[PDB]
Amino acid sequence: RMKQIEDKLEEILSKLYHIENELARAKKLLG
Amino acid sequence: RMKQIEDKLEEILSKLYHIENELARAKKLLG
Amino acid sequence: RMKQIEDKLEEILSKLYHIENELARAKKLLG
Amino acid sequence: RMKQIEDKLEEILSKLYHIENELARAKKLLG
Incomplete structure (x- = not known):
């Protein structure tokens, strides 16, 4: 899925903020 | 490719947790 | 979505450089 | 593009290794 993608992106970005x-x-x- | 995209997203995620x-x-x- | 995907990829990248x-x-x- | 995606993924992952x-x-x- 393409949203599923975008989804995972959002999560990755979230981790980066915390880092x-x-x-x-x-x-x-x-x- | 989408499977590969999906695999690399997880890999990124698991490195983030490691980090x-x-x-x-x-x-x-x-x- | 693809534009958004593309925007978030860059955002991730710029955070990585910051990090x-x-x-x-x-x-x-x-x- | 879908490869372009995968491309950026590869780069992001690269940064993570260095980090x-x-x-x-x-x-x-x-x-």
């Missing part, structure tokens, strides 16, 4: 948050934490803990 | 896990461990080491 | 940059800076802070 | 390498460095620098 970006997780990196913001780690940069702060590094002073 | 989020690596980063999770670093965040807590730095703790 | 690789964050991580690049942490690797060198730790240096 | 994984970059994280392996950073975990080593963290002892």
Whole structure:
């Protein structure tokens, strides 16, 4: 399916945002 | 191709989980 | 949809570059 | 295009591998 695609994209992108948050934490803990 | 597209989407997803896990461990080491 | 698929692929890509940059800076802070 | 898709997937995945390498460095620098 083509939406199914787009679906998975949306999820992948979601993970990326979280990773970006997780990196913001780690940069702060590094002073 | 769509199967391949579908396989690579999962692969991307499983790397993301791996990455989020690596980063999770670093965040807590730095703790 | 294909345009949207195409837009989200780029978005994913630009986050990846951002992430690789964050991580690049942490690797060198730790240096 | 559907290959164009798959194409971008391949690139995204490539970035993920590198990110994984970059994280392996950073975990080593963290002892």
